[PDB]
Amino acid sequence: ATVITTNQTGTNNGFYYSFWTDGGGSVSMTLNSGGNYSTSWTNCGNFVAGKGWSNGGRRNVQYSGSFYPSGNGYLALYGWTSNPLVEYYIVDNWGNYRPTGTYKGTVTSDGGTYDVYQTTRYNAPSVEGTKTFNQYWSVRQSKRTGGTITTGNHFDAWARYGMQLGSFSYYMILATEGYQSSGSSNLTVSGKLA
Ligand SMILES: OC[C@@H]1O[C@@H](O[C@@H]2[C@@H](O)[C@H](O[C@@H]3CO[C@@H](O[C@@H]4CO[C@@H](O)[C@H](O)[C@H]4O)[C@H](O)[C@H]3O)OC[C@H]2O[C@@H]2OC[C@@H](O)[C@H](O)[C@H]2O)[C@H](O)[C@H]1O
Ligand SMILES: [Cl-]
Ligand SMILES: [Cl-]
Ligand SMILES: [Cl-]
Ligand SMILES: [Cl-]
Ligand SMILES: [Cl-]
Ligand SMILES: [Cl-]
Ligand SMILES: [Cl-]
Ligand SMILES: [Cl-]
Ligand SMILES: [Cl-]
Ligand SMILES: [Cl-]
Ligand SMILES: [Cl-]
Ligand SMILES: [Cl-]
Ligand SMILES: [Cl-]
Ligand SMILES: [Cl-]
Ligand SMILES: [Cl-]
Ligand SMILES: [Cl-]
Ligand SMILES: [Cl-]
Ligand SMILES: [Cl-]
Ligand code: NA
Numbered sequence: 001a002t003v004i005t006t007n008q009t010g011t012n013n014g015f016y017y018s019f020w021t022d023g024g025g026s027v028s029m030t031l032n033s034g035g036n037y038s039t040s041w042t043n044c045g046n047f048v049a050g051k052g053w054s055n056g057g058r059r060n061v062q063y064s065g066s067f068y069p070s071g072n073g074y075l076a077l078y079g080w081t082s083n084p085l086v087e088y089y090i091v092d093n094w095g096n097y098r099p100t101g102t103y104k105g106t107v108t109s110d111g112g113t114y115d116v117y118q119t120t121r122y123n124a125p126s127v128e129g130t131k132t133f134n135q136y137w138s139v140r141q142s143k144r145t146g147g148t149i150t151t152g153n154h155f156d157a158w159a160r161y162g163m164q165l166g167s168f169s170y171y172m173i174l175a176t177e178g179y180q181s182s183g184s185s186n187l188t189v190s191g192k193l194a
Contacts, residue, residue: 004029004049009171012037015189016054018171020125021047027178035174035189036065044178048078051189056081056088056172058152061191063174067145069095071181077149078175081166085126085133088165090114090154093143095181107138107157110148114138116161127170136163145187149174152194 002012004019005028011017012031021027024045030038037051053059056079067075075093080086091099101119108114117137123130138154151172155165174189 002031004031012051015051016171016173017049017051018173019047019049021045022125024180036187038184038186039176040184041178042182044181046177046179048175048177050078050173050175050187052079052171052173054171056151056168056170058155058194059172059191060194061149061151061174061189062147063149063187063189064146065185065187067093067176067183067185067187069178069181069183071095071183072097072179073181073183074099074175074177075145075185076175076177077151077172078177079168079172080127080170082128082169083166084164085128085131086136086165087121087126087133088136088158090138090149090151092140092147092149093145094139095183097179099137099139101135101137104161104163105157107153109138109150109153112144113141114154114157115141116157116163118163134163136165150194
């Protein structure tokens with residue numbers, strides 16, 4: 001295993017990984033065999049970390065494990081596009097704070113119903129540095145840790161609702177995120193191209 005406490009991307013046991021923190025509190029990620037990783041955080045600022053793929057795409061993502069936020073955290077299939085720059089989230093779990101914004105309708109996927117939202121961040125950290133970009137969200141109506149995420153179901157619903165993705169030129173990870181919170185996660189990802 002490899003313990004990560006510093007911003008970086010790379011490959012571990014056949015999976016891409018990304019770790020980003022604003023540097024608040026205490027945040028680590030442990031990289032284990034295959035698609036396994038855990039995180040531990042105490043009074044974080046903001047972080048996003050997980051395993052997945054160097055480029056996004058239509059993928060039947062399978063994951064399992066545990067996600068235990070004390071306060072604000074997200075469990076999401078997470079990544080980015082270029083042209084346009086979009087930060088996208090398919091959220092299966094959260095803590096005290098449910099992501100919201102401009103409501104666009106619902107999509108049904110992997111045994112659940114998801115609420116679709118768009119938000120915008122101005123001059124914020126991104127995979128292209130300080131940038132303005134839209135965020136696309138699918139938020140499950142009931143919390144869970146584990147199952148299939150059919151990314152194609154979400155991408156197609158976003159497209160019907162006028163939320164067009166750019167090119168899958170950046171990573172797509174099964175992410176743990178925290179905001180001014182504590183917690184842990186212990187997750188395994190895999191998944192094949194649909
Ligand atoms: O990973 C090693 C580092 O890469 C270089 O710096 C930049 C990375 O920090 C950046 O990472 C992004 C930053 O944004 C994160 O998304 C945040 C997370 O919270 C969300 O809720 C919020 O909306 C959002 O703002 C995202 O998770 C991270 O993946 O990736 C880009 C990188 O900068 C680029 O480096 C290459 C260069 O060609 C570009 O000009 C430059 O912008 C550092 O070198 C190193 O620390
Ligand atoms: Cl490190
Ligand atoms: Cl590496
Ligand atoms: Cl390795
Ligand atoms: Cl590897
Ligand atoms: Cl990959
Ligand atoms: Cl859990
Ligand atoms: Cl709304
Ligand atoms: Cl809108
Ligand atoms: Cl609807
Ligand atoms: Cl549901
Ligand atoms: Cl907004
Ligand atoms: Cl944000
Ligand atoms: Cl827009
Ligand atoms: Cl629930
Ligand atoms: Cl759970
Ligand atoms: Cl499922
Ligand atoms: Cl593409
Ligand atoms: Cl990337
Ligand atoms: Na749009």
